[PDB]
Amino acid sequence: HMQSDSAVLQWANQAAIAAFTYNFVNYRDELQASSGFFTAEGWDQFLGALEQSNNLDAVKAKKLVVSAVATRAPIILQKGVLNGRYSWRVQMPILVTYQSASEFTQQNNVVTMLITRVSTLNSPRGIGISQFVVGPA
């Protein structure tokens, strides 16, 4: 297929938000529903990041609902060919909310994604996330 910068951005926006949209009940379904956003190596790294962080443990323990909204528009920091595949480094700030009847906590995070073109044979979108990095401010 074909990819536009603007299309890739809107897509990166969706993927970033989806990653922070789950709860103590549906986490497994939501987790798995997102695998399509990722490339082979991206899925491994994303899963690894999930295990290292304690987030899922607190969400379950405190039985929270996680949501997020884009704080500013996503931007392409850099684009070009990496290892034979056209790629985009996309960054977007977000406001994440962890809440329940008893708790309400918010975080300003910045998501940085490496997005690469892949075969539509395995990923109909034609692109996938190879690296998913979260940080503050």
Author numbering: 71 to 207
What does the literature reporting this entry say, word for word?
DotI is a 23 kDa inner membrane protein essential for intracellular growth of L. pneumophila within mammalian and protozoan cells. DotI has one transmembrane domain in its N-terminal region, followed by a periplasmic domain13. Structural analysis of the periplasmic domains of DotI and its R64 ortholog TraM demonstrated that DotI and TraM are structural homologs of the T4ASS protein VirB8.
The structure model of Form I (space group: P21212) was refined to a resolution of 2.2 Å with the working R and the free R factor of 19.1% and 23.5%, respectively, and Form II (space group: I432) to a resolution of 3.5 Å with the working R and the free R factor of 17.9% and 21.6%, respectively. Form I and Form II contain eight and four molecules in its asymmetric unit, respectively, and the structures of these molecules are almost identical. DotIC is a single domain protein composed of four helices (α1 - α4) in one half and one β-sheet in the other half. The sheet is highly twisted at its center with an interruption in β1, therefore can be divided into two parts, Sh1 and Sh2. Sh2 comprises βs, β1a, the C-terminal half of β2 and the N-terminal half of β3, and forms a large cleft with α3 and α4. The cleft of the molecule in the Form I crystal is filled by 2-methyl-2,4-pentanediol (MPD) molecules, which is included in the mother solution for the Form I crystal. DotIC forms a stack of two octameric rings in the Form I crystal. This asymmetric unit contains eight DotIC molecules that form a head-to-head stack of two half rings composed of four monomers each. The crystallographic two-fold axis at the center of the half rings produces the two octameric rings.
